[PDB]
């Protein structure tokens, strides 16, 4: 549960403008994953509704409920 931002200097095309390798992990954002663990939901339920939901952390807080179970083993 944390994050941050800064700096400014004309950017506007992408974050990382010299790395021919498709971005990493998954369109998953670890930010959201984070906004989620905030919340009150594991990491990895996290990631499993952002998995579904696709960042939109609106739809995953209610993937969660929509469907979840108990421990995760």
């Given at each position: 549960?944390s994050?941050g931002?800064?700096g400014l200097?004309?950017?506007?095309?992408?974050?990382?403008?010299?790395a021919?390798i498709?971005?990493?992990?998954?369109?998953?954002?670890?930010?959201?994953?984070?906004?989620?663990?905030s919340?009150?939901?594991?990491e990895?339920?996290?990631?499993?509704?952002?998995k579904a939901?696709?960042?939109?952390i609106?739809?995953?807080?209610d993937?969660?409920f929509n469907?979840?179970?108990?421990?995760?083993?």
């Amino acid at each position: 549960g944390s994050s941050g931002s800064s700096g400014l200097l004309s950017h506007m095309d992408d974050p990382d403008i010299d790395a021919p390798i498709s971005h990493q992990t998954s369109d998953i954002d670890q930010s959201s994953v984070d906004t989620l663990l905030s919340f009150g939901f594991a990491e990895d339920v996290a990631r499993k509704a952002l998995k579904a939901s696709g960042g939109d952390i609106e739809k995953a807080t209610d993937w969660v409920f929509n469907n979840s179970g108990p421990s995760s083993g």
